[PDB]
Symmetry: D2
Subunit: 257 residues, 4 copies
């Protein structure tokens, strides 16, 4: 099942969509700077693109640490991004009250992994009728995603994306199970599946070589999109050039059975 997000077709047999931007909104200008860069690279490579940012940092290094620009200011910034660039955007929500107002502005709203089992937040997101991205918890098996899908469905919203992030592997480590993508497709009605390679990397080319190998491996399984929380060199375009080459090949192969 494909999902239309404006002029973008997101699905598991469509050209991959890049979800990318920044961790936590800080200022208007450094936001537009970052998004202009993604847009420029994705445009020239021909890759559909959705800008990502949070307005709030939920887990902070200190009780005193910077927290982000918050909802009201956050939403202002998003509104600007859409105006300037004419692209979709995606952000996470943490509170049911937040859902409708965020959804007025943000094309896709995201269920944080830690909140994935919070029924209140599920219901309130569903009710917006917006496209929803479900961050698969590291502690949840691919087989359980169907249970989250069922709740959203029951709550009246079937416009759901499933987003791989890795799985708990002993203490403080993650592993990505490449078979999980297929399990999710098969059990969740072939909803779009996307791969958050960045957050999968708990833990040649160093880290850049790692991200590349892992991103290539996941996209080889035929996925709707790739989700980056970040990555004189042009590191982004080098990366994407290779992802696009593999994705174009994969998506040109007929599906078996």
């Amino acid at each position: 099942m494909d999902i239309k997000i404006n002029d973008i077709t997101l699905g598991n047999n469509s050209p991959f969509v890049l979800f990318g931007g920044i961790c936590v909104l800080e200022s208007l200008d450094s936001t537009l700077q970052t998004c202009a860069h993604y847009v420029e690279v994705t445009r020239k490579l021909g890759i559909p693109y959705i800008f990502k940012a949070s307005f709030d940092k939920a887990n902070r290094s200190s009780i005193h640490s910077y927290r982000g620009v918050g909802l009201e200011e956050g939403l202002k910034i998003f509104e600007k991004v859409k105006a300037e660039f004419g692209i979709p955007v995606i952000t996470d929500v943490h509170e049911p009250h937040q859902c409708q107002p965020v959804a007025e502005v943000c094309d896709v709203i995201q269920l944080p992994a830690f909140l994935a089992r919070q029924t209140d937040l599920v219901v309130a997101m569903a009710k917006t009728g917006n496209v929803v991205n479900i961050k698969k918890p590291q502690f949840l098996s691919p087989s359980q995603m169907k249970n989250i899908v069922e709740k959203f469905h029951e709550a009246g919203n079937g416009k759901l994306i499933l987003c791989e992030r890795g799985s708990s592997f002993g203490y403080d480590n993650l592993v990505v199970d490449m078979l999980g993508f297929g399990v999710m497709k098969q059990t969740c009605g072939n909803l779009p599946v996307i791969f958050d390679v960045t957050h999968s990397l708990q833990t040649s080319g160093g880290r850049r070589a790692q991200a590349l190998d892992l991103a290539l491996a996941g996209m080889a399984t035929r996925l709707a999109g790739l989700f980056l929380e970040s990555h004189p060199l042009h590191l982004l375009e080098d990366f994407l050039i290779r992802i696009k080459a593999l994705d174009d090949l994969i998506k040109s192969q007929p599906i078996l059975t």
Copy 2:
């Protein structure tokens, strides 16, 4: 480091405290009946006892399964439990705004595992000055607990309990790392460590609960955290007799 909860001394070298009760407050009369049974059995054996329930169950099986009685009625039930039985009570909080009204009533407030890294909530909990139970997420290593403890300390609250609930072991399964209790003690200032046997799990379930509880308590812990209907309620006395035996043995010998 010990914590006083009314007339109870909670600590890793003290007689174990039972944190026991039910999942979700759904009723008054039934809650009181269940509590009565825990009270009678624990009093009979001289085990210190804190009644546990949630008024607002976060992760429901379905979108419309009953979430519980809610904050206002829930606190009223806790008030009745405290008045009737003279025991402390423990409940979880999900939002900063809930912290004050819950803490005014409840002796221990609980940080759910899924919110354990939600700074806003941590700070709001700290600031109540209440005794706090920190539920360890299944995906967090024991060495990471110190980071939560630090955040509480920064925010002015040192009355903290760490609660073990197992660790993710491949898909779906949980394992309890018996070594983790010690790592928590050694890195978190020998704060009270308690073991949630019920949520660490998943004569079948009963025989597993007993083996697992005994194994945990053999490591020298402050308390044991369980839920009944979940242990069958009528077998509570037998279960506790066995836990007490082991706890009394272990605690009676000095640390080696």
Copy 3:
């Protein structure tokens, strides 16, 4: 199922048996010294005792790998003469089995080798009591598969030895629920706990906590290593505490 090993009764509802000794045999004199200590401590504590050592470290690097086989057996012969106790050692090759078995009362299947069907059969054939080291990669519900091979090869005197489970990379965890699973699915054969190898990744403190936790689940035995590994001088104090707990658990009816 209980298993008689000379005058020792080994079983999950019997007083725990200590399987103790050292990583590897290096000399006669050091072996007899370490054994002497184990025997005197266990005798006064009233704990049944089986001496453990390997004659070969088959997975090291390459010079000690130990005094090797021919010499090893010599030393085991001495140990048995002097102290009148049973002994246990591991075999890594099928041909080793029968000659090792003439001397050593319990023979051990190494964890890495549990799927080696020629070794299983050769071990089984000896008719000796067998200690099966549970592989780090094998679930407790699959121990039954190794048991079945031994049964089908005509030996039912099997001990199941927990040694921890793979947990991510380079770490182990001991699943305290595993003991019960093994009991229920493997016909209540003696289950023992290798606390030493489980600890692979203070030590004195973590070993005691881990050993107490396992024995709390009602086991036939404890399997451990010292060096002059628990510090040897601590063995008596360590064992006092293990016995204390074992005695309590074993006094409590099942169910």
Copy 4:
């Protein structure tokens, strides 16, 4: 580092090599039949191929499962496979004393995962001077493979292949860490790394094997290893991906 196996070049920047065949050797006629199938499909696609079988499999699922035709007849069968098809062959050994006579015939000799730490076998295998396939145990971290490599090096043989088989993931399940390949390359001197997709496992089974193989090969590997129409369609897909990947240079650093 590349390894030459007769006319084949095996290496992480070379077209992938297929390792495949039968579980255990039964008979000459049986072996030739199966081998011819692999040969026809691989030749038709231009994929280098090495025939795999055991002559004495020591880790089968029952005690009385057939272990194969044995050393003497096995080696006679391997000789005939080599002569008939002009391809290399690979077989496992589990006893030190087997190594020399096996190495007379078999181009590649394979260290079973369960013996990977067994020094005596490692030394006896090394001393053959043959190409060696090291099966990575499911309990061994990818950064530990360097220790095995070192033991082979000490014993005088560096013609080593590393074979991924997956990693213990809780109980029973195996997961393949796609990052482990890179770790092995980095720490083991860019020795050829191959992927045993079949073991790694336990649409259907087929759809899975496809996804998992494609994922591994996307990381740039010397070969694909298969345990116990269809083979053609699979290999077409692997080759497409492999050709694409291998034809691009490594990241600019």
